[PDB]
Design a protein around this ligand. Structure first.
Ligand code: CA
Ligand code: CL
Ligand code: CL
Ligand code: CL
Ligand code: CL
Ligand code: CL
Ligand code: CL
Ligand code: CL
Ligand code: CL
Ligand code: CS
Ligand code: CS
Ligand code: CS
Ligand code: CS
Ligand code: CS
Ligand code: CS
Ligand code: CS
Ligand code: CS
Ligand code: CS
Ligand code: CS
Ligand code: CS
Ligand code: NA
Length: 274
């Protein structure tokens, strides 16, 4: 039978889904280690691989399959339930089976998704530095109407130090930090001026290869909650621009404490989508 991971009602995605908004016909690209497209609780409609030797529709790491199910695990009588279980899901493989990738592969994936009409790009990846082409790619995606979401980073706090990674740190990109099921900041979650919102990231249960389900911790688990939440808002107001979706998630978040640690707080998609 179907488990509803705690993140889904914590962000109030269950309430939006119950009004009948589930992300139908919103295109979401998951830039990651690929997706196990044969998993019975996922429906991958397309994708691309910028990684040598691996197709887009297999996942030898498990990371991208897990991130994909938090966005879009099918609503049925098995496995788990995604935040937006009716989205059109695309696997854009920019990370190899060891979980890492090059800047030009990532840039390629961003461009691919912008060129192919994605509505939402999720990047559950980050690096300490970032590059020129990456900045342009995310800026061009956002100016073309794509909501761009990324994991803030799992560097924790460092006294006064901004520890947010790239691409989260670009202001075209929503930087997403992690809370647990008690809505407290997870310790590994990065902090800093660019931190925008928090979502579930500790103890997140989702699809995993092969055909199973697994619990992972990270701002990578938090990010897809916000990607799926973006898809829910668009399924309810299809004419909103990317700025408007982003400002709704931000400005309706539940305040949890200092924005250095929590951004504007915990997303609430019921309030955002209303
Ligand atoms: Ca399911
Ligand atoms: Cl299926
Ligand atoms: Cl590794
Ligand atoms: Cl610390
Ligand atoms: Cl910045
Ligand atoms: Cl708190
Ligand atoms: Cl508009
Ligand atoms: Cl707020
Ligand atoms: Cl306060
Ligand atoms: Cs499938
Ligand atoms: Cs592996
Ligand atoms: Cs289950
Ligand atoms: Cs924009
Ligand atoms: Cs730390
Ligand atoms: Cs709890
Ligand atoms: Cs608490
Ligand atoms: Cs902040
Ligand atoms: Cs739109
Ligand atoms: Cs609020
Ligand atoms: Cs406040
Ligand atoms: Na940002």
């Amino acid at each position: 039978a179907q488990t509803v991971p705690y993140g889904i009602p914590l962000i109030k995605a269950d309430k939006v889904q119950a009004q009948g908004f589930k992300g139908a016909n919103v295109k979401v690209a998951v830039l990651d280690t690929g997706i196990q497209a044969s998993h019975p609780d996922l429906n991958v409609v397309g994708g691309a691989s910028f990684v040598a030797g691996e197709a887009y529709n297999t996942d030898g790491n498990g990371h991208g399959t897990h991130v994909a199910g938090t966005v879009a695990a099918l609503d049925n009588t098995t496995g788990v339930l995604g935040v937006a279980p009716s989205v059109s899901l695309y696997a854009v493989k920019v990370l190899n089976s060891s979980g890492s990738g090059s800047y030009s592969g990532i840039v390629s994936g961003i461009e691919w998704a912008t060129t192919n009409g994605m509505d939402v790009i999720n990047m559950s990846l980050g690096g300490a530095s970032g590059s020129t082409a990456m900045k342009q790619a995310v800026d061009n995606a956002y100016a073309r109407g794509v909501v761009v979401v990324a994991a803030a980073g799992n560097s924790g706090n460092s006294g006064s130090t901004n520890t947010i990674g790239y691409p989260a740190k670009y202001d075209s990109v929503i930087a997403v930090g992690a809370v647990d099921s008690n809505s407290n900041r997870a310790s590994f979650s990065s902090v800093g001026a660019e931190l925008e919102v928090m979502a579930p990231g500790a103890g997140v249960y989702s699809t995993y290869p092969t055909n199973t389900y697994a619990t992972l911790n990270g701002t990578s688990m938090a990010s897809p909650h916000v990607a799926g939440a973006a898809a829910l808002i668009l399924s309810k107001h299809p004419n909103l621009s990317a700025s408007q979706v982003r400002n709704r998630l931000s400005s309706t978040a539940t305040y949890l404490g200092s924005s250095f640690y929590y951004g504007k707080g915990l997303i609430n998609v019921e309030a955002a989508a209303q």
